[PDB]
């Protein structure tokens, strides 16, 4: 039904963007999922489990697999939110319009829900943003935003834009809690999506943290479920990645418990401002 396009009767919550679009608060990330079957299966399994939001990017090389999983699921496309991103090499007005068309074609879609500037770089994000504004005017995209932007990048963009970014997708997990950027984005009504919400694997050690383990035990949930619920209760969109059917299902089962104020505080206090992923200041491979 059309109401499913607006995520009205469903188990998951949404965050509302400044243009009144409702964005599902939990999605499936697909970075490092191989194109073809691995991605298609992950996406299909996520949709079967109840997910209605997939996060991909041109540079993940698996937009084909994402669209294949959506089609294989049989769920009407209007009920699913798809995010993708313009890569560094495609920044600049005309290159961004072209990159969008390529992504839309690979995905097999008539429109994309959210299109993001993937990394700021230094010199082309303003012109890139103008292309996103054009795509939005043309109704090719339902929402437009950025990723890995710091307050200084956003302030610079604000001086030139007609439509302010609706989303900023940034690294955010219990060791790197982005307090300053979150304050800035709250002030200016820019929704935050957390990438590497689980720390991007075992190296970072988040899922073995003792505090998370104790909270998990109290709720008979897993540490991953606790982290995802912490994201939810902070009003953050979260896009945990798994290619494993069981873990995909586990990460969705977060709507039937609540963390207390004290549990939320305990997780907040894990912050070390320890960045696990790439730094917006110097990560811009592939610029042209
Ligand atoms: N905008 C950007 O610049 C940017 C950058 C990085 C990431 N992202 C997006 O954010 C998404 C999420 O971040 P991420 O992929 O870096 O990592 P993540 O979601 O923080 O962690 C994924 C890792 O955790 C494992 N895992 C997932 N669920 C689990 C569970 N319940 N129990 C135990 N282990 C679990 C996964 O293994 P299995 O797959 O084997 O389950 C994988 O090794 C990406 O996929 C991508 O969509 C965006």
mmCIF file of C-alpha atoms and ligand atoms in Angstrom:
data_model
loop_
_atom_site.group_PDB
_atom_site.id
_atom_site.type_symbol
_atom_site.label_atom_id
_atom_site.label_comp_id
_atom_site.label_asym_id
_atom_site.label_seq_id
_atom_site.Cartn_x
_atom_site.Cartn_y
_atom_site.Cartn_z
ATOM 1 C CA UNK A 1 0.000 0.000 0.000
ATOM 2 C CA UNK A 2 1.032 3.614 -0.571
ATOM 3 C CA UNK A 3 1.252 4.229 3.207
ATOM 4 C CA UNK A 4 4.224 1.802 3.305
ATOM 5 C CA UNK A 5 6.179 4.348 1.199
ATOM 6 C CA UNK A 6 5.879 6.617 4.275
ATOM 7 C CA UNK A 7 6.707 3.914 6.843
ATOM 8 C CA UNK A 8 3.459 4.401 8.809
ATOM 9 C CA UNK A 9 2.452 0.856 9.799
ATOM 10 C CA UNK A 10 5.670 -0.967 10.679
ATOM 11 C CA UNK A 11 7.866 -2.121 13.583
ATOM 12 C CA UNK A 12 10.815 0.183 12.953
ATOM 13 C CA UNK A 13 10.920 3.909 13.753
ATOM 14 C CA UNK A 14 11.763 6.733 11.356
ATOM 15 C CA UNK A 15 13.636 10.015 11.600
ATOM 16 C CA UNK A 16 11.959 12.980 9.868
ATOM 17 C CA UNK A 17 14.105 15.080 7.545
ATOM 18 C CA UNK A 18 13.697 18.813 7.155
ATOM 19 C CA UNK A 19 11.582 18.395 4.028
ATOM 20 C CA UNK A 20 9.157 16.124 5.999
ATOM 21 C CA UNK A 21 10.415 12.899 4.372
ATOM 22 C CA UNK A 22 10.402 9.941 6.768
ATOM 23 C CA UNK A 23 13.647 7.953 6.753
ATOM 24 C CA UNK A 24 13.693 4.433 8.276
ATOM 25 C CA UNK A 25 15.922 4.581 11.321
ATOM 26 C CA UNK A 26 17.475 1.140 10.794
ATOM 27 C CA UNK A 27 19.020 0.042 7.499
ATOM 28 C CA UNK A 28 21.413 -2.545 6.108
ATOM 29 C CA UNK A 29 24.893 -1.377 5.111
ATOM 30 C CA UNK A 30 26.534 -3.259 2.231
ATOM 31 C CA UNK A 31 30.138 -1.986 2.189
ATOM 32 C CA UNK A 32 32.464 -5.014 1.678
ATOM 33 C CA UNK A 33 29.651 -7.239 0.442
ATOM 34 C CA UNK A 34 30.779 -8.648 -2.930
ATOM 35 C CA UNK A 35 28.590 -7.727 -5.874
ATOM 36 C CA UNK A 36 26.240 -10.398 -7.140
ATOM 37 C CA UNK A 37 24.957 -13.146 -4.892
ATOM 38 C CA UNK A 38 26.563 -12.029 -1.612
ATOM 39 C CA UNK A 39 24.968 -8.575 -1.811
ATOM 40 C CA UNK A 40 21.684 -9.747 -3.379
ATOM 41 C CA UNK A 41 21.267 -12.394 -0.675
ATOM 42 C CA UNK A 42 22.091 -9.992 2.173
ATOM 43 C CA UNK A 43 19.635 -7.411 0.839
ATOM 44 C CA UNK A 44 16.899 -10.000 0.214
ATOM 45 C CA UNK A 45 17.378 -11.537 3.665
ATOM 46 C CA UNK A 46 17.268 -8.083 5.261
ATOM 47 C CA UNK A 47 14.044 -7.234 3.456
ATOM 48 C CA UNK A 48 12.573 -10.616 4.447
ATOM 49 C CA UNK A 49 13.490 -9.868 8.081
ATOM 50 C CA UNK A 50 11.734 -6.478 7.946
ATOM 51 C CA UNK A 51 14.425 -3.973 6.905
ATOM 52 C CA UNK A 52 13.171 -1.224 4.609
ATOM 53 C CA UNK A 53 16.420 0.734 4.087
ATOM 54 C CA UNK A 54 19.630 -0.233 2.256
ATOM 55 C CA UNK A 55 22.829 1.878 2.258
ATOM 56 C CA UNK A 56 25.157 1.522 -0.714
ATOM 57 C CA UNK A 57 27.520 3.711 -2.813
ATOM 58 C CA UNK A 58 28.934 3.700 -6.309
ATOM 59 C CA UNK A 59 32.378 2.882 -4.871
ATOM 60 C CA UNK A 60 31.080 -0.234 -3.046
ATOM 61 C CA UNK A 61 30.767 -1.787 -6.531
ATOM 62 C CA UNK A 62 27.517 -3.546 -5.594
ATOM 63 C CA UNK A 63 24.632 -1.317 -6.685
ATOM 64 C CA UNK A 64 23.746 -4.084 -9.182
ATOM 65 C CA UNK A 65 23.465 -6.618 -6.349
ATOM 66 C CA UNK A 66 21.381 -4.212 -4.230
ATOM 67 C CA UNK A 67 18.762 -3.802 -6.963
ATOM 68 C CA UNK A 68 18.791 -7.534 -7.623
ATOM 69 C CA UNK A 69 18.098 -8.255 -3.938
ATOM 70 C CA UNK A 70 15.268 -5.731 -3.890
ATOM 71 C CA UNK A 71 13.645 -7.290 -6.967
ATOM 72 C CA UNK A 72 14.160 -10.860 -5.684
ATOM 73 C CA UNK A 73 12.448 -9.948 -2.398
ATOM 74 C CA UNK A 74 9.197 -9.170 -4.240
ATOM 75 C CA UNK A 75 8.486 -6.218 -1.922
ATOM 76 C CA UNK A 76 7.220 -3.211 -3.907
ATOM 77 C CA UNK A 77 10.146 -0.826 -4.452
ATOM 78 C CA UNK A 78 8.181 2.129 -3.028
ATOM 79 C CA UNK A 79 8.282 0.445 0.407
ATOM 80 C CA UNK A 80 12.105 0.346 0.499
ATOM 81 C CA UNK A 81 14.510 3.255 1.071
ATOM 82 C CA UNK A 82 17.720 3.249 -0.997
ATOM 83 C CA UNK A 83 20.690 5.501 -0.268
ATOM 84 C CA UNK A 84 23.643 5.833 -2.604
ATOM 85 C CA UNK A 85 26.538 8.263 -2.939
ATOM 86 C CA UNK A 86 28.553 10.232 -5.483
ATOM 87 C CA UNK A 87 32.180 9.159 -5.397
ATOM 88 C CA UNK A 88 35.164 11.511 -5.237
ATOM 89 C CA UNK A 89 36.078 11.076 -8.909
ATOM 90 C CA UNK A 90 32.586 12.181 -9.953
ATOM 91 C CA UNK A 91 32.446 15.471 -8.063
ATOM 92 C CA UNK A 92 31.665 18.602 -10.087
ATOM 93 C CA UNK A 93 28.284 19.613 -11.484
ATOM 94 C CA UNK A 94 28.094 17.691 -14.761
ATOM 95 C CA UNK A 95 30.060 14.687 -13.485
ATOM 96 C CA UNK A 96 27.699 14.388 -10.522
ATOM 97 C CA UNK A 97 24.578 14.479 -12.719
ATOM 98 C CA UNK A 98 26.134 11.740 -14.859
ATOM 99 C CA UNK A 99 27.181 9.652 -11.849
ATOM 100 C CA UNK A 100 23.657 9.835 -10.459
ATOM 101 C CA UNK A 101 22.218 8.493 -13.697
ATOM 102 C CA UNK A 102 24.720 5.633 -13.686
ATOM 103 C CA UNK A 103 23.859 4.714 -10.088
ATOM 104 C CA UNK A 104 20.113 4.868 -10.790
ATOM 105 C CA UNK A 105 20.584 2.596 -13.817
ATOM 106 C CA UNK A 106 22.738 0.070 -11.953
ATOM 107 C CA UNK A 107 20.179 -0.061 -9.133
ATOM 108 C CA UNK A 108 17.348 -0.409 -11.687
ATOM 109 C CA UNK A 109 15.339 2.451 -10.157
ATOM 110 C CA UNK A 110 13.345 5.433 -11.446
ATOM 111 C CA UNK A 111 14.207 7.492 -8.339
ATOM 112 C CA UNK A 112 16.656 7.207 -5.449
ATOM 113 C CA UNK A 113 15.514 8.010 -1.895
ATOM 114 C CA UNK A 114 18.731 9.654 -0.670
ATOM 115 C CA UNK A 115 21.806 10.783 -2.578
ATOM 116 C CA UNK A 116 24.910 11.821 -0.633
ATOM 117 C CA UNK A 117 28.195 13.554 -1.333
ATOM 118 C CA UNK A 118 30.409 10.671 -0.224
ATOM 119 C CA UNK A 119 33.499 12.594 1.039
ATOM 120 C CA UNK A 120 33.997 16.364 1.188
ATOM 121 C CA UNK A 121 37.485 16.744 -0.304
ATOM 122 C CA UNK A 122 38.422 20.437 -0.502
ATOM 123 C CA UNK A 123 37.328 22.247 -3.660
ATOM 124 C CA UNK A 124 34.405 20.622 -5.503
ATOM 125 C CA UNK A 125 31.727 19.896 -2.876
ATOM 126 C CA UNK A 126 29.885 23.194 -3.393
ATOM 127 C CA UNK A 127 29.508 22.574 -7.138
ATOM 128 C CA UNK A 128 28.588 18.936 -6.455
ATOM 129 C CA UNK A 129 25.889 20.106 -4.068
ATOM 130 C CA UNK A 130 24.395 22.266 -6.843
ATOM 131 C CA UNK A 131 23.913 19.076 -8.884
ATOM 132 C CA UNK A 132 22.169 17.396 -5.942
ATOM 133 C CA UNK A 133 19.856 20.439 -5.705
ATOM 134 C CA UNK A 134 19.061 20.053 -9.430
ATOM 135 C CA UNK A 135 18.318 16.322 -9.056
ATOM 136 C CA UNK A 136 16.040 17.159 -6.113
ATOM 137 C CA UNK A 137 14.223 19.867 -8.123
ATOM 138 C CA UNK A 138 13.755 17.284 -10.917
ATOM 139 C CA UNK A 139 12.182 14.802 -8.421
ATOM 140 C CA UNK A 140 14.847 12.210 -9.245
ATOM 141 C CA UNK A 141 15.803 12.012 -5.554
ATOM 142 C CA UNK A 142 13.575 12.331 -2.469
ATOM 143 C CA UNK A 143 16.279 13.706 -0.166
ATOM 144 C CA UNK A 144 19.828 15.033 -0.493
ATOM 145 C CA UNK A 145 22.712 15.153 1.953
ATOM 146 C CA UNK A 146 26.388 14.700 2.677
ATOM 147 C CA UNK A 147 28.755 12.280 4.355
ATOM 148 C CA UNK A 148 31.892 12.860 6.434
ATOM 149 C CA UNK A 149 31.305 16.619 6.638
ATOM 150 C CA UNK A 150 32.694 18.516 9.617
ATOM 151 C CA UNK A 151 31.143 21.719 10.962
ATOM 152 C CA UNK A 152 33.569 23.792 8.871
ATOM 153 C CA UNK A 153 32.523 22.016 5.658
ATOM 154 C CA UNK A 154 28.853 22.515 6.459
ATOM 155 C CA UNK A 155 29.326 26.203 7.300
ATOM 156 C CA UNK A 156 31.158 26.680 4.007
ATOM 157 C CA UNK A 157 28.369 24.904 2.109
ATOM 158 C CA UNK A 158 25.670 26.953 3.878
ATOM 159 C CA UNK A 159 27.143 30.118 2.311
ATOM 160 C CA UNK A 160 26.380 28.789 -1.172
ATOM 161 C CA UNK A 161 23.410 26.427 -0.974
ATOM 162 C CA UNK A 162 19.719 26.934 -1.710
ATOM 163 C CA UNK A 163 18.658 23.740 0.113
ATOM 164 C CA UNK A 164 20.641 22.741 3.195
ATOM 165 C CA UNK A 165 21.783 19.116 3.543
ATOM 166 C CA UNK A 166 19.151 16.857 5.090
ATOM 167 C CA UNK A 167 21.490 14.118 6.317
ATOM 168 C CA UNK A 168 25.156 13.862 7.346
ATOM 169 C CA UNK A 169 26.334 10.246 7.417
ATOM 170 C CA UNK A 170 29.417 9.939 9.649
ATOM 171 C CA UNK A 171 31.379 7.387 11.650
ATOM 172 C CA UNK A 172 29.597 7.033 15.005
ATOM 173 C CA UNK A 173 29.885 4.296 17.607
ATOM 174 C CA UNK A 174 30.512 4.058 21.342
ATOM 175 C CA UNK A 175 34.248 4.870 20.994
ATOM 176 C CA UNK A 176 33.734 7.866 18.645
ATOM 177 C CA UNK A 177 30.555 9.696 19.582
ATOM 178 C CA UNK A 178 30.896 12.887 17.489
ATOM 179 C CA UNK A 179 29.560 15.177 20.209
ATOM 180 C CA UNK A 180 30.527 18.480 18.579
ATOM 181 C CA UNK A 181 29.262 17.530 15.119
ATOM 182 C CA UNK A 182 26.052 16.143 16.621
ATOM 183 C CA UNK A 183 25.424 19.408 18.460
ATOM 184 C CA UNK A 184 25.968 21.342 15.208
ATOM 185 C CA UNK A 185 23.676 19.081 13.193
ATOM 186 C CA UNK A 186 20.961 19.166 15.870
ATOM 187 C CA UNK A 187 21.074 22.964 15.910
ATOM 188 C CA UNK A 188 20.668 23.098 12.108
ATOM 189 C CA UNK A 189 18.165 20.257 11.672
ATOM 190 C CA UNK A 190 20.509 17.895 9.790
ATOM 191 C CA UNK A 191 19.800 14.230 10.579
ATOM 192 C CA UNK A 192 22.758 12.018 11.466
ATOM 193 C CA UNK A 193 23.335 8.506 10.119
ATOM 194 C CA UNK A 194 25.971 6.396 11.903
ATOM 195 C CA UNK A 195 28.417 4.485 9.787
ATOM 196 C CA UNK A 196 30.554 1.711 11.274
ATOM 197 C CA UNK A 197 27.967 1.705 14.077
ATOM 198 C CA UNK A 198 29.391 -1.587 15.393
ATOM 199 C CA UNK A 199 33.032 -0.557 14.913
ATOM 200 C CA UNK A 200 33.480 -2.289 11.510
ATOM 201 C CA UNK A 201 34.559 -5.671 12.845
ATOM 202 C CA UNK A 202 36.532 -7.307 15.585
ATOM 203 C CA UNK A 203 39.694 -5.159 15.422
ATOM 204 C CA UNK A 204 37.960 -2.217 17.131
ATOM 205 C CA UNK A 205 36.665 -4.550 19.867
ATOM 206 C CA UNK A 206 33.360 -2.776 20.514
ATOM 207 C CA UNK A 207 31.218 -5.906 20.661
ATOM 208 C CA UNK A 208 33.451 -7.399 23.397
ATOM 209 C CA UNK A 209 33.285 -4.300 25.634
ATOM 210 C CA UNK A 210 32.441 -5.270 29.215
ATOM 211 C CA UNK A 211 29.897 -2.506 29.815
ATOM 212 C CA UNK A 212 27.988 -3.411 26.652
ATOM 213 C CA UNK A 213 28.171 -7.056 27.715
ATOM 214 C CA UNK A 214 26.612 -6.318 31.101
ATOM 215 C CA UNK A 215 23.800 -4.266 29.575
ATOM 216 C CA UNK A 216 23.223 -7.014 26.967
ATOM 217 C CA UNK A 217 23.015 -9.589 29.770
ATOM 218 C CA UNK A 218 20.441 -7.513 31.658
ATOM 219 C CA UNK A 219 18.197 -7.402 28.580
ATOM 220 C CA UNK A 220 18.965 -10.876 27.221
ATOM 221 C CA UNK A 221 20.137 -9.201 24.025
ATOM 222 C CA UNK A 222 23.500 -9.177 22.247
ATOM 223 C CA UNK A 223 26.037 -6.343 22.538
ATOM 224 C CA UNK A 224 25.332 -5.491 18.866
ATOM 225 C CA UNK A 225 21.615 -5.183 19.596
ATOM 226 C CA UNK A 226 22.424 -2.935 22.564
ATOM 227 C CA UNK A 227 24.576 -0.632 20.393
ATOM 228 C CA UNK A 228 21.879 -0.444 17.700
ATOM 229 C CA UNK A 229 19.254 0.354 20.371
ATOM 230 C CA UNK A 230 21.550 3.072 21.802
ATOM 231 C CA UNK A 231 21.730 4.599 18.298
ATOM 232 C CA UNK A 232 17.925 4.443 18.046
ATOM 233 C CA UNK A 233 17.325 6.100 21.415
ATOM 234 C CA UNK A 234 19.741 8.886 20.476
ATOM 235 C CA UNK A 235 17.584 9.630 17.393
ATOM 236 C CA UNK A 236 20.399 8.524 15.054
ATOM 237 C CA UNK A 237 19.811 6.498 11.869
ATOM 238 C CA UNK A 238 21.998 3.381 11.957
ATOM 239 C CA UNK A 239 23.127 1.159 9.087
ATOM 240 C CA UNK A 240 24.864 -1.913 10.515
ATOM 241 C CA UNK A 241 26.347 -4.269 7.913
ATOM 242 C CA UNK A 242 26.135 -8.032 7.780
ATOM 243 C CA UNK A 243 26.265 -10.592 4.989
ATOM 244 C CA UNK A 244 25.195 -13.360 7.411
ATOM 245 C CA UNK A 245 21.493 -14.286 7.495
ATOM 246 C CA UNK A 246 21.469 -14.875 11.250
ATOM 247 C CA UNK A 247 23.231 -11.632 12.142
ATOM 248 C CA UNK A 248 21.100 -9.649 9.686
ATOM 249 C CA UNK A 249 18.066 -10.982 11.572
ATOM 250 C CA UNK A 250 19.655 -10.368 14.974
ATOM 251 C CA UNK A 251 20.412 -6.730 14.152
ATOM 252 C CA UNK A 252 16.712 -6.099 13.321
ATOM 253 C CA UNK A 253 15.413 -7.488 16.634
ATOM 254 C CA UNK A 254 15.807 -4.216 18.528
ATOM 255 C CA UNK A 255 12.219 -2.939 18.808
ATOM 256 C CA UNK A 256 11.077 -5.001 21.796
ATOM 257 C CA UNK A 257 13.378 -3.595 24.497
ATOM 258 C CA UNK A 258 14.454 -0.216 25.845
ATOM 259 C CA UNK A 259 17.668 1.004 27.461
ATOM 260 C CA UNK A 260 17.243 2.928 30.715
ATOM 261 C CA UNK A 261 18.550 6.455 31.186
ATOM 262 C CA UNK A 262 21.428 5.029 33.218
ATOM 263 C CA UNK A 263 22.292 2.411 30.567
ATOM 264 C CA UNK A 264 22.321 5.132 27.924
ATOM 265 C CA UNK A 265 24.643 7.212 30.137
ATOM 266 C CA UNK A 266 27.000 4.276 30.705
ATOM 267 C CA UNK A 267 27.346 3.768 26.952
ATOM 268 C CA UNK A 268 27.773 7.518 26.386
ATOM 269 C CA UNK A 269 30.688 7.457 28.840
ATOM 270 C CA UNK A 270 32.581 4.883 26.727
ATOM 271 C CA UNK A 271 33.499 7.705 24.334
ATOM 272 C CA UNK A 272 37.220 8.081 23.614
ATOM 273 C CA UNK A 273 36.986 10.140 20.400
ATOM 274 C CA UNK A 274 38.879 7.264 18.772
ATOM 275 C CA UNK A 275 38.328 7.437 15.011
ATOM 276 C CA UNK A 276 38.452 3.911 13.447
ATOM 277 C CA UNK A 277 37.728 4.840 9.844
ATOM 278 C CA UNK A 278 39.148 7.381 7.420
ATOM 279 C CA UNK A 279 39.627 11.044 8.243
ATOM 280 C CA UNK A 280 37.595 13.622 6.287
ATOM 281 C CA UNK A 281 40.648 15.896 6.259
ATOM 282 C CA UNK A 282 42.817 13.705 4.027
ATOM 283 C CA UNK A 283 40.661 10.882 2.612
ATOM 284 C CA UNK A 284 39.853 11.808 -0.995
ATOM 285 C CA UNK A 285 41.247 9.118 -3.282
ATOM 286 C CA UNK A 286 40.259 9.327 -6.941
ATOM 287 C CA UNK A 287 39.750 13.103 -7.251
ATOM 288 C CA UNK A 288 39.747 14.493 -10.844
HETATM 289 N N1 LIG B 1 29.730 7.205 4.234
HETATM 290 C C1 LIG B 1 30.882 6.573 4.453
HETATM 291 O O1 LIG B 1 31.974 7.096 4.211
HETATM 292 C C2 LIG B 1 30.854 5.189 5.020
HETATM 293 C C3 LIG B 1 32.017 4.611 5.532
HETATM 294 C C4 LIG B 1 31.965 3.348 6.083
HETATM 295 C C5 LIG B 1 30.760 2.659 6.100
HETATM 296 N N2 LIG B 1 29.641 3.229 5.573
HETATM 297 C C6 LIG B 1 28.337 2.530 5.590
HETATM 298 O O2 LIG B 1 28.084 2.081 6.933
HETATM 299 C C7 LIG B 1 27.799 0.681 6.888
HETATM 300 C C8 LIG B 1 28.133 0.045 8.226
HETATM 301 O O3 LIG B 1 29.504 0.212 8.587
HETATM 302 P P1 LIG B 1 30.556 -0.971 8.398
HETATM 303 O O4 LIG B 1 30.189 -1.833 7.247
HETATM 304 O O5 LIG B 1 31.889 -0.293 8.357
HETATM 305 O O6 LIG B 1 30.605 -1.814 9.757
HETATM 306 P P2 LIG B 1 29.626 -2.197 10.993
HETATM 307 O O7 LIG B 1 28.215 -2.260 10.554
HETATM 308 O O8 LIG B 1 30.047 -1.297 12.093
HETATM 309 O O9 LIG B 1 30.276 -3.613 11.313
HETATM 310 C C9 LIG B 1 30.188 -4.687 10.372
HETATM 311 C C10 LIG B 1 31.003 -5.843 10.940
HETATM 312 O O10 LIG B 1 30.344 -6.355 12.117
HETATM 313 C C11 LIG B 1 29.955 -7.724 11.886
HETATM 314 N N3 LIG B 1 28.635 -7.893 12.502
HETATM 315 C C12 LIG B 1 27.490 -7.357 12.056
HETATM 316 N N4 LIG B 1 26.463 -7.646 12.859
HETATM 317 C C13 LIG B 1 26.974 -8.390 13.860
HETATM 318 C C14 LIG B 1 26.425 -9.020 15.048
HETATM 319 N N5 LIG B 1 25.119 -8.951 15.341
HETATM 320 N N6 LIG B 1 27.279 -9.721 15.805
HETATM 321 C C15 LIG B 1 28.582 -9.829 15.526
HETATM 322 N N7 LIG B 1 29.172 -9.270 14.473
HETATM 323 C C16 LIG B 1 28.396 -8.549 13.638
HETATM 324 C C17 LIG B 1 30.004 -7.929 10.386
HETATM 325 O O11 LIG B 1 30.257 -9.296 10.070
HETATM 326 P P3 LIG B 1 29.251 -10.142 9.124
HETATM 327 O O12 LIG B 1 29.041 -9.372 7.859
HETATM 328 O O13 LIG B 1 30.018 -11.428 8.947
HETATM 329 O O14 LIG B 1 27.988 -10.323 9.932
HETATM 330 C C18 LIG B 1 31.147 -7.016 9.987
HETATM 331 O O15 LIG B 1 32.408 -7.650 10.223
HETATM 332 C C19 LIG B 1 28.606 0.215 5.688
HETATM 333 O O16 LIG B 1 28.269 -1.117 5.271
HETATM 334 C C20 LIG B 1 28.282 1.294 4.689
HETATM 335 O O17 LIG B 1 26.950 1.072 4.208
HETATM 336 C C21 LIG B 1 29.678 4.460 5.044
#
